[model samples]
Target: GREQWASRLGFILAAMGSAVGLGNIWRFSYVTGENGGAAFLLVYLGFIALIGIPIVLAEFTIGRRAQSDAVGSFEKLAPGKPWKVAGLMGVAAGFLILSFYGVIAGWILFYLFNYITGQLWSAPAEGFGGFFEGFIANPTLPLFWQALFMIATIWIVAIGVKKGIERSNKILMPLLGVLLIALAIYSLTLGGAKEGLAFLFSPDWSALKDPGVYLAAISQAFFTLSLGMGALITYGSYVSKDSRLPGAAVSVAGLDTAFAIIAGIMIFPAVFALGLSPSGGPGLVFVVLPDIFDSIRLGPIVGIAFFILLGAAALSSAVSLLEVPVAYFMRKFDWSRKQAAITLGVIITLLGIPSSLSFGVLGEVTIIPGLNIFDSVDFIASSVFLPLGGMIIALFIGWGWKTSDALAESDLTDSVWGKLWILSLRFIAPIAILIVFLSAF
Candidate 1:
């Protein structure tokens, strides 16, 4: 009675949609900028191969085999075991992460609207930093944009999987892909291409010794791939068993990584050309890029193109984030899809209010040092919950299930690669995660 992806391509694009989001462009650029760019990319790529791909395969195996919600997958697989706690964490992450995720995505919506209206075609009278600071601190305006974004997310989720999620990704994936390519091409034509390429690809070998860099790479891998978040599990649940999974996992991871690299290509060139700092923190795009664009002839159109790409990526990802909880709630309460989507969607949007206000009314409130409500929520989700869930998932597949069962579901089938995957899940991923957490503490 469960819905399935209409085709193999549908499932693949949806999974890629979930993977390719702000995590790729927004998170990746700033993190790489901070962590010694090329060195960070090296560790990040290594972790993707060692940890990210395997866990992705693990989640997909469990989901396709059990054919249930994230929580229900564990409950059905190992009844009365503690393993479902991972699923519970995933569900919690869905609510907590998306609450703030919507807030950030709303900024994209805010920018995209203004860019289209030509309000932001040229740098504002007050400058981009002053403009961005004023916009977020306005209180009312941020919530309006946030509400609009959440509405779009909920509407897509309320429509069901194939008609809504799959089809939307089908349109969005190609659109964003083209925008990204076009923008990168234009960025390369800028005079700073060589400098930007060096900043992005030239390694500062010393960064490899920093424990924080390890933590950043691993966490970014989890975040960008949508791993440990129940998104892949929910998406994989709809995939029919006849399709092979390894190729799909590899393709999704590869494409997600490509987006990040290409984004760096687009961003850093402009940054270097304008002599802006690469480590501009979270406002690198919002503040730094506008400054860069203002000095160029094609700046306005580039601004429009960039934000459109970002907004589309955010929307695709928001749909998947909402699906995680909606799937859980639907199965838990026996509610219709619309009922679950609408109810949970509204609740999450309300939860995001504090995060939106953190820039204005609640600006001084800090849950963690240097982090406001919005930042604290992001840290807890990205730095803590995601990696912890990923570790448990690795353990669950590596130790809880029989080796043969895991291999069968993954379509790896007793091959050498299958055994290596199981080994990685059992030891490499969990150990690496624990060490990173310890090092960070």
Candidate 2:
């Protein structure tokens, strides 16, 4: 039987859980705080509305209309010839991304252990950077951790979608929200809390002139919302006709934005209060957050809670990333769910080695001029596959597929706002993706 989502609420929460990850809680907050705060947020929000939403809706519509996995969904809907290659690309992107993404999840796991053991509190400065760097340089450690993370992902997939993913989301999403709210409350007590709040909410119009700001805003919006990727489409395929795709997409976007904003509230005050620089790349959470935690009252308990919540966020996204390829395998090859789960799990575990090694022995391996395995995976997905996949989704839905049939199937098709959304997806959103794609080079 084709797997339908257990419930509408379950599906929405599961998709949102996947969409909101380390990018929302850690990297988004750090980048926005460092890059003129409210101005960056405003620009990023605008991009999400104008560009992100439309593309998201397009992906949803296609998935629901086809009612299949990435490869089969396109092949069924795409006219003239099968879109087997496009489908393959989407699966490949998910597989490539999770290989490294799980390794990074291992870093979060290691830090969680350090926080719980009070090792992080002993020497905050050395514990943060030195610990992260030392782990990165030790190939054996990353391999073991990566293997553990991949095994966890595989175990969930083995249980099947409803029992595994939807069930996990039911427990994890609410806990993540409560933990985040608690952290935000704690952040408000910092000496520089007011300054951080002002920085986050006050707009700086002058910063708009920088091309870098627009590029960053656009990319962040795309990445943060999980757009221009097939993940949304795969999730959408499980939705029932009673579910309004536009409404669900908007809700997910709003929740995703809220998490990013709250993460800023949790992070900025601590950075300002402790006089720590917010410019660290990828390592900001690992380095800066620990320093801040060591300085505050009840630091150890708060630090452990924070890292645990982070691990929850990371695992939520990792599960979704793994699902994309698993779904593809089942739909295209007609493999049983159990077999697909085990086989894909093993393959990803092996693929994860290069990414795990990137921190240590294979650290010298370079793909692009200055990029390593992690950076290359990010670049290919963000710069190449994401935008291109988004463009294909837009064109396929708007032009290749029959609009009349699509409108009849989608619940929102009669609404004025829905019509406008379709137009934007057909034209504006694709152009925005193209502009960013060209600018990246």
Candidate 3:
């Protein structure tokens, strides 16, 4: 049987939890670092308002009304129509996303476990970069850790939402918040605080003029909020009909935005303090931040805490990614929840091995001219799949669905903000998304 949230709080937490994941911390910080921090931040915030919130409300309306999985939600809303392609793409994204997501999350867990075991008390013999490279380059241990993360994901979803997901988010999010804030405070105390703030706040206007900056901001906004991928649609399906979608959407987006900025504060200060450069290409936290941690007071203990909180945040979001496919399969095949969870969980685990090795033995196998396996999958999902899914979703709510019906379904009828949201979906969001897709060339 399909399960609903135990309470409104649980539903909101799960939704917020989904929105707050790897992108908020790792990707957001790096993209902001690359795109002239505050300038890029400003662009991201604008998209969050015009783009993120509208899709959130749209997904909530679709899920709660149809009470179905991502793909089936579209089927129920508009039977025998091509709109289902949006959800279908989402399901495909779920698989592609979680595969690499598990690999990264596994790397996070490996770091956490190492810190707990005292391996991070000082820099490794090879230095942090060499140490990091050695571990991820090996095909064996990375897959083990990835499988461990995947198993944890499967176990949770198999138990049903109310039992596993809701309770986990309710406990973890508050802890995640406190630790991130404390980490940022501690980071600001480092000697490099001034440089860090400049890196994060001072804008180079030239970067703003570059179309690359806008494109980076849009992709980050979409990825951070889990917008285009149907994770929100899946989470929203478990929400009660009486729940107000607009307020819920706003709350999730607000918390999500807050988390990312706080993460930037937590990171850039330390990056500058330690004289480490923030590379936009997945190396800041994974490679550079470890060097800073070992120099700080009681660094290992703090490292343990930070990674735990990060792992928890990632896991919370991971479950939502898993749920998208689990919900789809359960509905499509009439399979039991446990069956869908286990089946996909194992498949994703095996599928992620290549990504796990992309940094190691398979390093030379480029999926694109310059990108390796992990980067290839990430590119496919984030650049191609997500925006395509998002554009179709925006078009559906904007043009295909009845405006009065959507307003009523989202409980936005006759409100001024509601009018604005409808307008964004109808025109603003679609045009913006289309432009982003074209901007790469």
Looking at candidate 2, the ten consecutive residues that score lowest on lDDT are 79-88
Rate residue 357 of model 1 by lDDT: 89
Q: Report the alpha-carbon TM-score of model 3 versus the true structure.
A: 0.96
Clashing pairs in 1: none
Q: What is the C-alpha lDDT of each candidate?
A: 0.86, 0.75, 0.84
Provide the lDDT at 342 for model 2: 84
How far off is model 3, as Cα RMSD?
1.6
Model 1 misplaced regions, further than 4 Å: 169-171, 292-299
* Off by more than 4 A, model 3: none
Indicate the residue-level lDDT of 71 in model 1. Answer: 91
Question: After aligning candidate 2 to the native by TM-score, how far in Å is the CA of 386 from where it should be?
Answer: 1.2
lDDT string, candidate 1, 333-438, tens digits: 9999999988999999999989988987898999989889887887778888888999999999999998878888889978789989999999999999999999
Q: How do the residues 1-441 of candidate 3 rate in per-residue lDDT, one tens digit apiece?
A: 468997877888788888898988887877787677777888889999998899989888888888889988998889998999999888888899899889889889999999988998798899987888788877798888888888888999998887887878456678878888887887888887888888787766787768878877877888888977878888888888677788889999999999988988888888777667665467567775677677788889878877888898899889988999898888889889899999989998888888888887988899877889988887778777877788789889889888889899988977789789989989999889888778765
- TM-scores, all candidates, are 0.95, 0.90, 0.96
lDDT tens string, model 2, 1-441?
577787788778877887888778766865686678888888888888877777777777778778888777877776546455656667777777777777778887877877777677756454666777887788688777777777777888777777787776456666777777877787789787877788777888897766556667776776777765568778888887678776777888888888888888877777677676665556666666676677677878877877777787877777878778788888778888888888998888788778777766777889878978766777777556765777776666666656676566555665777677767767887787677666656
Q: List all candidate RMSDs to the true structure.
A: 1.8, 2.6, 1.6
